[PDB]
Design a protein around this ligand. Structure first.
Ligand code: APC
Ligand code: 2KH
Ligand code: MG
Length: 292
């Protein structure tokens, strides 16, 4: 087993002050721009937003979301029934406006286009800025204009595909679980993140447990497994996961399946590998060996 004080150290949160100033910096850049078709909202997502950052110097995940228009899953007839009209302002236009705003503020050398994000070197931390449009997921019987689930969506030009995320729901649901576990959920995420990273530093696979997938995996664990001590939490969580049916796990946003064939999803075999390494870490810590 792993000593409690070691697990408790692994549960510590990295500083967030520099990350908040990174967020405030991006927001100030966009506040200075003259927006032709709606001013986007700017919020954080990722570990800093969810209080699961294990360092204070990791990249800041920023969402820049246009809400004056929305993409959706409606058919043309359903859009008509709701009185929606086509926006002539596209995701591409909005992206170009966001990029111009950031470039005007930080300088061209500090703003560059990534695969899925605009990457910005601020005077604080690097920011990964997701430029997205509000997404409305309507139910299969589409009857009322207000009955939808809100996410966001963005285009990936190098892959000719659209991504739909639900970061606000990811945050809301993680906070709710943290409330209901008497605040053990987020420290437990960080404990496992630091345990994973400790193993990666010693030579374990780089993709042993990508942070987002690890949060989603732990989100599916019953609240009763979190609490008491970190030692009891480590074992109760891991022992439950070893016996669980992973196939029906949902992401923390409550909408998507965690495991599947799409590029946003994980695989059960990778999840099982993570559990094996945590098992070995636990049983391996206090044990002596010798050559056979
Ligand atoms: N496969 C994926 N599917 C849906 N959303 C994803 C995603 N990967 C990343 N994201 C979104 O981008 C956010 C930040 O991505 P990452 O930085 O890779 C995870 P993180 O929680 O910030 O851990 P970190 O502390 O190692 O940075 C995630 O919290 C999520 O909102
Ligand atoms: O579904 C997603 C995937 C990714 N992201 C955000 O995109 C960033 C990169 O996501 P990524 O590292 O998984 N993809 P990558 O090929 O490295 O593209 P890029 O790094 O942009 O050149 C991540 O750090 C997230 O902040 C989302 O917001 N939603
Ligand atoms: Mg992050």
């Amino acid at each position: 087993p792993v000593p409690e004080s070691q697990l408790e150290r692994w549960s510590h949160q990295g500083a967030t002050t520099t990350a908040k100033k990174t967020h405030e910096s991006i927001r100030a850049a966009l506040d200075r721009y003259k927006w032709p078709k709606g001013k986007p909202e700017v919020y954080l997502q990722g570990s800093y937003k969810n209080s699961t950052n294990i360092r204070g110097d990791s990249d800041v995940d920023v969402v820049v979301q246009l809400n004056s228009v929305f993409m959706n899953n409606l058919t043309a007839e359903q859009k008509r029934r709701f009185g929606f009209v086509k926006s002539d302002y596209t995701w591409n236009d909005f992206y170009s406006d966001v990029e111009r705003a950031l470039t005007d503020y930080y300088g061209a050398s500090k703003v560059r286009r990534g695969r899925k994000t605009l990457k910005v070197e601020t005077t604080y931390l690097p920011a990964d800025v997701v430029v997205c449009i509000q997404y409305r997921k309507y139910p299969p019987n589409r009857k009322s204009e207000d009955d939808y689930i809100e996410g966001m969506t963005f285009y990936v030009p190098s892959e000719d595909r659209w991504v739909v995320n639900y970061p606000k729901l990811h945050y809301e649901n993680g906070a709710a679980k943290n409330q209901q576990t008497n605040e053990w959920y987020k420290p437990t995420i960080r404990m496992f993140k630091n345990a994973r990273t400790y193993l990666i530093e010693q030579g374990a696979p780089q993709d042993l447990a990508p942070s987002y997938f690890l949060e989603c995996l732990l989100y599916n664990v019953p609240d009763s497994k979190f609490g008491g001590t970190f030692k009891d939490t480590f074992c109760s969580v891991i022992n439950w996961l070893k016996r669980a049916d992973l196939s029906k796990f949902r992401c923390q946003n409550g909408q998507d399946d965690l495991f599947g064939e799409f590029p946003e999803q994980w695989s059960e075999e990778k999840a099982r590998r993570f559990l094996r390494y945590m098992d070995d870490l636990w049983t391996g810590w206090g044990q002596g060996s010798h050559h056979h």
